[PDB]
Design a protein around this ligand. Structure first.
Ligand SMILES: CCCCCCCCCCCCCCCC(=O)O
Length: 131
């Protein structure tokens, strides 16, 4: 049901904490926390496409479930990303110089909840989006 819908950020918790654990610069942290991103996912048979707007601009990237690839996320951070698509749960594992982070995306109707964990901190961050 989530395919083709645009989800917009409505609220977030502990996101600043998570970014600190990532060792990002203060200006990047400020820009990310102030962003009001949107995201739309599409299925293309063999691959999926994710279109995002906000900080770091507008982009559409394609990927296959289970395959790692070189990527750039956030405000220009270089990482190795790997997404696993399993029904209504999309898990994005990212490996960067700072460590590893997991972004668990759960879709339920018009709501999308993203739970984020990091290898450098014990807190849990949440991003709530609505279509
Ligand atoms: C320990 C982290 C290593 C990788 C570095 C990650 C840098 C963080 C910037 C990522 C923001 C991505 C937005 C979260 C995803 C979502 O909201 O759906």
């Amino acid at each position: 049901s989530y395919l083709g819908k645009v989800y917009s950020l409505v609220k977030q918790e502990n996101f600043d904490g998570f970014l600190k654990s990532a060792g990002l610069s203060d200006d990047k942290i400020q820009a990310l926390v102030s962003d009001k991103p949107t995201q739309k996912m599409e299925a293309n048979g063999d691959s999926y496409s994710n279109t995002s707007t906000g900080g770091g601009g507008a982009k559409t990237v394609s990927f296959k479930s289970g395959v790692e690839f070189d990527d750039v996320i956030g405000a220009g951070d270089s990482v190795k990303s790997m997404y696993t698509v399993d029904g209504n749960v999309v898990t994005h594992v990212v490996k960067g110089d700072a460590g590893v982070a997991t972004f668990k995306k759960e879709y339920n109707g018009d709501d999308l909840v993203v739970t984020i964990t990091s290898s450098n901190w014990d807190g849990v961050a949440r991003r709530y989006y609505k279509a």
